[PDB]
């Protein structure tokens, strides 16, 4: 389930294929904003629009939404703080 949070924020009915664990410095790099703890990158792929939608929640069992990131085929991502 974090799919409903995705859909609720993009009208996108996607299915998460992977959730990678990343430390605050790794994420602080790309996102440019440092989370207080390890965040999980739940990644789903929107084949219709050819982009990779990822949701960033805290670690289990919190799973609190931290940000949503939509990267396109170019490798550029739209970052949205939740």
């Amino acid at each position: 389930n974090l799919s409903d949070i995705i859909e609720k924020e993009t009208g996108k009915q996607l299915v998460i294929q992977e959730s990678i664990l990343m430390l605050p410095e790794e994420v602080e790099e790309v996102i440019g904003n440092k989370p207080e703890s390890d965040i999980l990158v739940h990644t789903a792929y929107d084949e219709s629009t050819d982009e990779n939608v990822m949701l960033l929640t805290s670690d289990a069992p919190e799973y609190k939404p931290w940000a949503l990131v939509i990267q396109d085929s170019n490798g550029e991502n739209k970052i949205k703080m939740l």
Binding site: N1, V15, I16, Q17, E18, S19, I20, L21, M22, L23, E25, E26, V27, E29, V30, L40, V41, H42, T43, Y45, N52, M54, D59, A60, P61, Y63, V69, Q71, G75, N77
Partner: protein
């Protein structure tokens, strides 16, 4: 001629390990869907023997979706959509190895048979909740595994992508084994250094230059 059993016999019985198995088994009994199926739980060691380890790629935990995970890091079951991070891995191989071409499937058995140990730091997960079994005792186990390869082998290649993986790398003696790091193939960080790290090639060069046969990075579907 040294088997995983030879170096893992003792550990197979210590406290934590049996507790972990007991725990994982109880959840199953109460009705919790845990991935992967057990017959698959220790597939990495089934396909790749201690003596046959050449390259080692670290994972985190099993794909929590259904049909996905089958005991090997990154690798999914045939018929399943290629996961984001694996697909990116594929591109690199495409851009680094001449002739290499996208498989259309994510089944990585052939890589294990060749000496690639696709070991995940954590071996089980609760269907739906990613990272559910962290701190169940698995890290301790795999932690040991790495320590065993590091002390009972020579000239092994370690591919650590991401801070998490690199951390477990602290154990590995850099003089005795070839340790290569890089950002995770995840779309999030892929472009921050994973693309163009030439790992699959550097890994093979070393192997040759050490009298070892290289790794045909093209995944084949068995029969």
């Amino acid at each position: 001629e040294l088997t995983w059993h030879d170096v893992l016999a003792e550990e197979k019985q210590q406290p934590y390990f049996l507790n972990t198995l007991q725990t994982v088994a109880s959840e199953r009994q109460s009705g919790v869907t845990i991935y992967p199926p057990q017959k698959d739980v220790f597939n990495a060691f089934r396909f790749t023997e201690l003596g046959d380890v050449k390259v080692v790629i670290l994972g985190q935990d099993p794909y929590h979706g259904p049909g996905q995970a089958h005991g090997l890091a990154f690798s999914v079951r045939p018929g399943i959509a290629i996961p984001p991070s694996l697909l990116n891995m594929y591109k690199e191989l495409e851009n680094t190895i001449p002739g290499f071409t996208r498989p259309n499937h994510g089944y990585l058995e052939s890589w294990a048979r060749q000496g690639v140990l696709l070991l995940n730091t954590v071996l089980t997960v609760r269907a739906g909740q990613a990272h559910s079994h962290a701190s169940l005792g698995w890290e301790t186990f795999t932690d040991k595994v790495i320590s065993l390869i590091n002390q009972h082998r020579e000239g092994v290649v370690f591919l650590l992508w991401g801070s998490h993986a690199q951390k477990k790398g602290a154990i590995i003696d850099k003089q005795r084994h070839h340790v290569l790091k890089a950002p995770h193939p995840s779309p999030l960080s892929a472009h921050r250094g994973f693309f163009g790290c030439n790992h699959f090639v550097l890994a093979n060069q070393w192997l040759e230059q050490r009298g070892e046969t290289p790794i045909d990075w093209m995944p084949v579907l068995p029969a």
